Design a protein around this nucleic acid. Structure first.
Ligand SMILES: [Mg+2]
Ligand SMILES: [Mg+2]
Ligand SMILES: [Mg+2]
Ligand SMILES: [Mg+2]
Ligand SMILES: [Mg+2]
Ligand SMILES: [Mg+2]
Ligand SMILES: [Mg+2]
Ligand SMILES: [Mg+2]
Ligand SMILES: [Mg+2]
Ligand SMILES: [Mg+2]
Ligand SMILES: [Mg+2]
Ligand SMILES: [Mg+2]
Ligand SMILES: [Mg+2]
Ligand SMILES: [Mg+2]
Ligand SMILES: [Mg+2]
Ligand SMILES: [Mg+2]
Ligand SMILES: [Mg+2]
Ligand SMILES: [Mg+2]
Ligand SMILES: [Mg+2]
Ligand SMILES: [Mg+2]
Ligand SMILES: [Mg+2]
Ligand SMILES: [Mg+2]
Ligand SMILES: [Mg+2]
Ligand SMILES: [Mg+2]
Ligand SMILES: [Mg+2]
Ligand SMILES: [Mg+2]
Ligand SMILES: [Mg+2]
Ligand SMILES: [Mg+2]
Ligand SMILES: [Mg+2]
Ligand SMILES: [Mg+2]
Ligand SMILES: [Mg+2]
Ligand SMILES: [Mg+2]
Ligand SMILES: [Mg+2]
Ligand SMILES: [Mg+2]
Ligand SMILES: [Mg+2]
Ligand SMILES: [Mg+2]
Ligand SMILES: [Mg+2]
Ligand SMILES: [Mg+2]
Ligand SMILES: [Mg+2]
Ligand SMILES: [Mg+2]
Ligand SMILES: [Mg+2]
Ligand SMILES: [Mg+2]
Ligand SMILES: [Mg+2]
Ligand SMILES: [Mg+2]
Ligand SMILES: [Mg+2]
Ligand SMILES: [Mg+2]
Ligand SMILES: [Mg+2]
Ligand SMILES: [Mg+2]
Ligand SMILES: [Mg+2]
Ligand SMILES: [Mg+2]
Ligand SMILES: [Mg+2]
Ligand SMILES: [Mg+2]
Ligand SMILES: [Mg+2]
Ligand SMILES: [Mg+2]
Ligand SMILES: [Mg+2]
Ligand SMILES: [Mg+2]
Ligand SMILES: [Mg+2]
Lengths: 134, 259, 158
RNA sequence: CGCGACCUCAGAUCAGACGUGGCGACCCGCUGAAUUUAAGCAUAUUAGUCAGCGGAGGAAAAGAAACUAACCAGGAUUCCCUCAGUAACGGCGAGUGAACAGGGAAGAGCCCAGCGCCGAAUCCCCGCCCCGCGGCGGGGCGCGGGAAAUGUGGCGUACGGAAGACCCACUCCCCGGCGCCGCUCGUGGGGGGCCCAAGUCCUUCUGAUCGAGGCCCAGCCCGUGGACGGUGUGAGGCCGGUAGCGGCCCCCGGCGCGCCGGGCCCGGGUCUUCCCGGAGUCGGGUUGCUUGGGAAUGCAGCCCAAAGCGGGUGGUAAACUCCAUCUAAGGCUAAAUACCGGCACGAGACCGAUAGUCAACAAGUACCGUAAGGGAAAGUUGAAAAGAACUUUGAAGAGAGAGUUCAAGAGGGCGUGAAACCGUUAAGAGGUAAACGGGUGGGGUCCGCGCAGUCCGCCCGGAGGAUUCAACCCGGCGGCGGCCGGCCGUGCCGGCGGUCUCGGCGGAUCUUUCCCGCUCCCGGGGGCGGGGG
RNA sequence: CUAACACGUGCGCGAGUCGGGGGCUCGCACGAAAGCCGCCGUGGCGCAAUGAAGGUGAAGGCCGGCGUCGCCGGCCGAGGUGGGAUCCCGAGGCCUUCCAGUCCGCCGAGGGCGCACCACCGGCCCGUCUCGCCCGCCGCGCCGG
RNA sequence: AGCCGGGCGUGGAAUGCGAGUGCCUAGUGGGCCACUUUUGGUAAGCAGAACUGGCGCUGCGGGAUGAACCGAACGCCGGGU
RNA sequence: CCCAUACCCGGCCGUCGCUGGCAGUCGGCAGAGCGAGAAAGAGAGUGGCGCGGACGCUACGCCGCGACGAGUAGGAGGGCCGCUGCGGUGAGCCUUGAAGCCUAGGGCGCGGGCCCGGGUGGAGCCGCCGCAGGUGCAGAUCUUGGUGGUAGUAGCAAAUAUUCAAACGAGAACUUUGAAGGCCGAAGUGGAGAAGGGUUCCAUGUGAACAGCAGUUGAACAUGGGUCAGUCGGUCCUGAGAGAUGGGCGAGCGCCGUUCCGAAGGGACGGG
RNA sequence: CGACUCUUAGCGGUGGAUCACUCGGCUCGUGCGUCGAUGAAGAACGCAGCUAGCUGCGAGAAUUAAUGUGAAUUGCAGGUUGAUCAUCGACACUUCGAACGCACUUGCGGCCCCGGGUUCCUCCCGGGGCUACGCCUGUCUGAGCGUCGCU
């Protein structure tokens, strides 16, 4: 149960903050879990999604064992687009269907210097937390 | 409500004539809200009848002796299996409902230890019942931070906090109370008496110092003693079925005499 | 209009009383704030008494209460002088001092002199310089047992 | 006449500064009604309130007695409880209405003028040199300028003070710069940034699962984390978070330590001698307002107008007489207290789009009035636009097919879709407007999932089939009762009773055997406070 | 809705009762709750009334000591009449083979003790009026009782 | 006149019926009609009184109709009168 | 002979009274009563096989006898009548379908109301013990919103007047062109300005809405364009007047006053 | 029979009730408690590739710098030595407005210094800096048959 008096548990306040968070909070919010192999390798559970990571779709009409590369991340709509998930409209042109990152798992990451810095920081903090828990 | 809600406008009644209902009306202007009826409880918009005021008598005071009497009654009723079961608590496996454990549990630090202790004492069925009872509240209370409701679980009375509160904090339905600071609001949830309670050895020892015996006053309180019994032998079955009262009775007329 | 039988009443609600209403919904918050300030000051003055300076014995000035004994505003100059305390040093070493009070009698004066002498015997005075002590000072060994005391110093008893 | 001082008064786009206006919830100073009540109404009341004017701060104002009291006396201001709806005022009608004492929150005291003493010992500004300078300061040098004797600074203020002599003590305090170490209330001050546990496990519903069942014997995994929010319904374990005296980084502060420079030479007691106070002010008369203040509580105008063992107060006017208590007409001062404005937050037994702010939305917006000003209506497709390609009739609006969707029985003011009212279909009826109550009859839509009519014991008879009854033995369990022990008593009696004390708690019971401390008395006698018995 | 008052009802305590203001509880999910104070009952209401005020301020009944007792002791104790729910007593009376003879329980003339309450008669306290005598002393009086 | 104590029950007309007592209290304070009695008035469905009963507050059978007349007052029904 | 809600008999509901009865369900450990005209003991004592027996009793419950039942203003009681939220509780319900809404379906209750079936709907809801209230509508010339009959009705009648042909176009009484007949009649139905309007001006396009018929048209809508100054005006002067300083008044924002209680010229030929 | 009218039901309109949702209110509490001549509050006008409103901003005009963060913004186009967001200490900040040269038409000036004409010799054009009231301390220049002193 929350005991900090300076953080709110009000439903309307939380929803307002969620729906008007700025883009650099949207990046934090749209994070998705790593695969089992990546989790065991990096000792990290979740990672904010980037432009060209690939994904397994876990829930929804498009769940399956297809590795799909993300094409772009629409933070305004809280959505990512995957190069394989898509549907054709009336005229026949094909448009991407939005998938929320929370229903998404990374197969392997795009290892940029900032990405590996973030991974090492997360792993170090988790390991020191576990060592304190010892 | 706001002290000036409904009175923000400036309106006068058109008065006799004009074939209108003789009520204040928004004056002038080329707007829908013009000549519409401003004040009064019967008008759209406008003031409520008898606006609620912040200086309502929200709080009440109860006599200290009455509070202590209620606490004593709740404590006494918590020791009767019939009342505790009728409160809904599942205690059919509990070895002894005035449940007392040693002071070693007062130093528990992890939730797993508390869960194991509950399983050993066979009170885990009440926690399972609470888990099953966890549901969604009905009505407009959902949009007012009262989204989720659940059943009350057992109470745990301790004497010193040595991680006891942290250990049992996360288990749903468990209510922790210090033995020196009991409150009726948690001892008798609902106004109904007979909540299931689990005592520690130190708290059980301190009980009779807190509230005194029949022949000894309470040491920790200034001058308090247990409330006197109005009737001692409350076994009505005996009081009827005893020879000395049955002797002084007339024969029971039990033949019906219909019209 | 009067009913059958009852009391004549004079309610004082003929003014705009609803505009000047003092609700007490901030009473618990006020108590919490006063407490916090109290403990903050008690921590601020580290070994000094939390209540404050000692005060004197006085008699309530009325036929209704002249049998009772209060805590006064401060010791007067006659009492300080006959107890051998300077009026300026008393305030800085913890004795409340006022110059308004007279002394018509001798019993009260002697009682307050006894109080001041007891206070001198009881207080522990820290070095003006922590390294080198001075003549009018307390030795080092009893400094280790200097602690704040709660409530008024030497409380008044009837 | 001229030249030179001083006085008084001008002029500047002279050098350098300062004020204006706004907000105004809370505060201070003025001015200040009438609705209303009195069942009329003029005094009263509303009310020193609304409106009007001025001036601030983070609080303001008040404030260290020209006080309260009459007691065995208290002792600045402010705030709460009580005094108390009381003393009192009032066409003594309606109504109005304090204060002292007492308990608390907080608690802090001080400074001038005068009287005097010190060679004006004082202050501001310009130039140069040295320090750091984003709150313009410190040191030095200037035969630099000015203020000021029509009075600056040190000592000093009613609690007395000063000077001299004699005894006693007899020095580290503050400031301007520089560096250092550690600490910082509940948690180590504050602020910011980045991170930290556990199922998308196996089946099964669904359009979509966060649903349902299971996960052994570690009763899936975490839990100091089962608040909340998001995600295609309903999630402790998907994600953000949540808990944690959890982690890392950056910045600012406060407290201590050290160094340099600068100022400072300071106190207490006794004796002797001196000195000591605020004027068109107090006070009196009158007038007007105000107050509970009543032969005048407070304020103000006018007239009169002081004294120094004096003056003020002592709640009924006056004279005489003793007592009590302060020292007016100069000044500063935090805390407790107030806060419908502002910034940033937390919460709710509140409202849920005719409600709640007027305003959930391009709302003080559209719009009205010359202007002062007045002032709305208006939320909802869908999980995702997947927002209907294409064919066909029409000039087109608009349709029929086709298609998306779980659903178009959600088609762009699209969730649900009521009533009033209307169109059409079906049934029935119809010349005393219609409608209605009671009683039947007739016809209908649906229902009984009606249409050979209930079941239940105990027997009698017949056809069957079982590992089969009663009685015994073994073991266990329970109920009831009478011998051995044990526990409790809102019962009694006793003991040489009790860890050292030979238990604790209390007592308006005692204590020349008690003891200690304090005061009085010439080591001694008596009283008081505490401890002991 | 708030405040005041009256009465009726329910609960706690009871000649008392009540922490509402404040404080102590590691402040803080609930909790702005709850607990505690007792040398924090100041204070309010109640326990005493009456008078404008100075003020005063709530029983007495029997025997021995000087009835034509001055006046000390021994006592006994907060009235009396009527009506009074209940309780006590109890003449008599409640069965069966008879007879002697009990136990226990129920009945019941009359007679007791009489709750609350009502009515009436007395008594006591304060103001006021009339009559009349006596007593006390630190100050013997425009004194006090 | 008041006190005490004592003795007398055939409960001293008929009929009927439990009674006494205490708080708190709403609405009302425009009335109207009829037999009889009665004042003013030429008189009135006028104005004003006394007694009783009604209407108002009340439906039902009758007076064809009807606030007051005659009968009778009321829970939902069957039979009889 | 006929009939009222009157009277008599019977059934049922309720109220009131009896301050009525029942703890006695006393069972192989037992013995089944306290209805019977007569105040009170089925009194206790001592001497001459088959193992068996319905319901009950939420005592705030159940049962039995009688009498009675009008009602405005008004008073009281009970509501397992209803609405919203809170503390408890139902191992409650619910995407295998909640709320809400509709119904010629089946029922319950005297009633307030409620329970099922069917349909629509798509995400929450209710029972019981308590607590709280902004808690129940037929009216108030009630407020807001919506919709009728009237009614395809009143009406589209002030200022003489239109007709022929062609073009465009789906579409012509109303547009455009040509022809004819008319009116305004120079104090105009003409040509230009001021005030006011503010893009209405011009070209192209459209025909959803508006132009109270219609439109191929418009001052409508949609795209674009358009206002050129030494000499035309403003700009300068002063008029009636308005308004600072000095001064005066004023609690005060300020007001009076305009030469009046003012050291009111910052200019110049020339000379040094 | 048919029309018309009435009733009930099905369906379809009309309308927008009910129910369920809620980035909004209301109320209570907490900490802080800060505007302006170095130009405030308020108003006006402008600023986007496509932009009317709302919002943001000021000729550096839906924003510059710096720091943190670390790959987007998005309706369509275009193009890691750091995109976008956030923070915000550097810089900038049009016209009115206490509003300040005089007035309110944006009209008319004055003084000083620069750049064009000149080649300062004056005009003219452009640019920059000053030019409000009251008041304080000081400076300078003064006035007075005001009080005096030497000639
Ligand atoms: Mg945290
Ligand atoms: Mg409103
Ligand atoms: Mg609902
Ligand atoms: Mg009345
Ligand atoms: Mg009136
Ligand atoms: Mg009048
Ligand atoms: Mg008046
Ligand atoms: Mg007044
Ligand atoms: Mg005002
Ligand atoms: Mg100002
Ligand atoms: Mg300020
Ligand atoms: Mg101040
Ligand atoms: Mg003083
Ligand atoms: Mg005082
Ligand atoms: Mg009182
Ligand atoms: Mg009078
Ligand atoms: Mg007054
Ligand atoms: Mg006081
Ligand atoms: Mg204190
Ligand atoms: Mg001096
Ligand atoms: Mg599951
Ligand atoms: Mg996580
Ligand atoms: Mg007055
Ligand atoms: Mg007097
Ligand atoms: Mg003075
Ligand atoms: Mg003073
Ligand atoms: Mg002051
Ligand atoms: Mg809270
Ligand atoms: Mg709605
Ligand atoms: Mg809608
Ligand atoms: Mg659907
Ligand atoms: Mg719809
Ligand atoms: Mg038909
Ligand atoms: Mg009354
Ligand atoms: Mg008459
Ligand atoms: Mg009647
Ligand atoms: Mg009748
Ligand atoms: Mg007739
Ligand atoms: Mg009949
Ligand atoms: Mg009958
Ligand atoms: Mg009735
Ligand atoms: Mg219907
Ligand atoms: Mg939905
Ligand atoms: Mg409500
Ligand atoms: Mg209605
Ligand atoms: Mg027509
Ligand atoms: Mg013309
Ligand atoms: Mg023209
Ligand atoms: Mg045109
Ligand atoms: Mg038209
Ligand atoms: Mg030209
Ligand atoms: Mg003027
Ligand atoms: Mg129809
Ligand atoms: Mg723009
Ligand atoms: Mg930048
Ligand atoms: Mg950057
Ligand atoms: Mg002009």
């Amino acid at each position: 149960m929350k005991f900090n008096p300076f953080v709110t548990s009000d439903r309307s306040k939380n929803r307002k903050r969620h729906f008007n968070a700025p883009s650099h909070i949207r990046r934090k919010i749209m994070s998705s879990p790593l695969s089992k192999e990546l989790r065991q390798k990096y000792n990290v559970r979740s990672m904010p999604i980037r432009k060209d990571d690939e994904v397994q779709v876990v829930r929804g009409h498009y769940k399956g064992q297809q590795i799909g590369k993300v094409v772009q991340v629409y933070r305004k709509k809280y959505v990512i687009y995957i190069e394989r998930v898509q549907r054709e409209k009336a005229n026949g042109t094909t448009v991407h269907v939005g998938i929320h990152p929370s229903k998404v798992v990374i197969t392997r990451l795009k290892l940029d210097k900032d990405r590996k810095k973030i991974l090492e920081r997360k792993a170090k903090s988790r390991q020191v937390g576990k060592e304190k828990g010892k | 409500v706001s002290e000036l809600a409904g009175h923000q406008t400036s309106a006068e009644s058109w008065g006799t004539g004009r074939a209108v209902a003789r009520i204040p009306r928004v004056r002038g202007g080329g707007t829908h809200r013009s000549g519409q009826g401003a004040f009064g409880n019967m008008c759209r918009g406008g003031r409520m009848f008898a606006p609620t005021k912040t200086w309502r008598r929200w709080h009440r005071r109860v006599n200290t002796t009455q509070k202590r009497y209620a606490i004593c009654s709740a404590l006494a009723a918590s020791a009767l299996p019939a009342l505790v079961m009728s409160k809904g608590h599942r205690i059919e496996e509990v070895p002894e409902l005035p449940l007392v454990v040693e002071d070693k549990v007062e130093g528990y630090k992890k939730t797993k230890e508390a869960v194991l202790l509950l399983k050993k004492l066979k009170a885990w069925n009440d926690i399972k019942k609470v888990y099953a009872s966890q549901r969604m509240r009905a009505g407009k209370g959902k949009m007012r931070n009262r989204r989720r409701i659940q059943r009350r679980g057992p109470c745990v009375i301790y004497n010193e906090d040595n991680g006891i509160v942290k250990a049992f904090r996360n288990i749903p339905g468990i209510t922790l109370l210090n033995v020196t600071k009991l409150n009726i609001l948690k001892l008798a949830p609902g106004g109904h008496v007979g909540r299931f309670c689990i005592w520690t050895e130190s708290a059980f020892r301190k009980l009779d110092d807190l509230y005194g015996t029949w022949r000894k006053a309470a040491s920790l309180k200034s001058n308090y003693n247990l409330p006197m019994h109005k009737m001692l032998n409350t076994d009505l079955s005996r009081i009827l079925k005893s020879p000395e009262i049955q002797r002084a009775l007339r024969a029971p007329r039990k033949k019906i005499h219909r019209r | 209009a009067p009913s059958r039988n009852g009391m004549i009443l004079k309610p004082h609600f003929h003014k705009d009383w609803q505009r000047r209403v003092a609700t007490w919904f901030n009473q618990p918050a006020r108590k919490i704030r006063r407490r916090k300030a109290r403990q903050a000051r008690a921590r601020r003055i580290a070994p000094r008494p939390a209540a404050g300076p000692i005060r004197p014995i006085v008699r309530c000035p009325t036929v209704r209460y002249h049998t009772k004994v209060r805590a006064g505003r401060g010791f007067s100059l006659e009492e300080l002088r006959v107890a051998g305390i300077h009026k300026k040093v008393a305030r800085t070493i913890g004795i409340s001092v006022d110059p308004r009070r007279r002394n018509k009698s001798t019993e009260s004066l002697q009682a307050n002199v006894q109080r001041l002498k007891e206070y001198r015997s009881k207080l522990v005075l820290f070095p003006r310089k922590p390294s080198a002590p001075k003549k009018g000072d307390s030795s080092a060994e009893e400094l280790k047992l200097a602690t704040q005391l709660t409530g008024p110093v030497m409380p008044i008893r009837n």
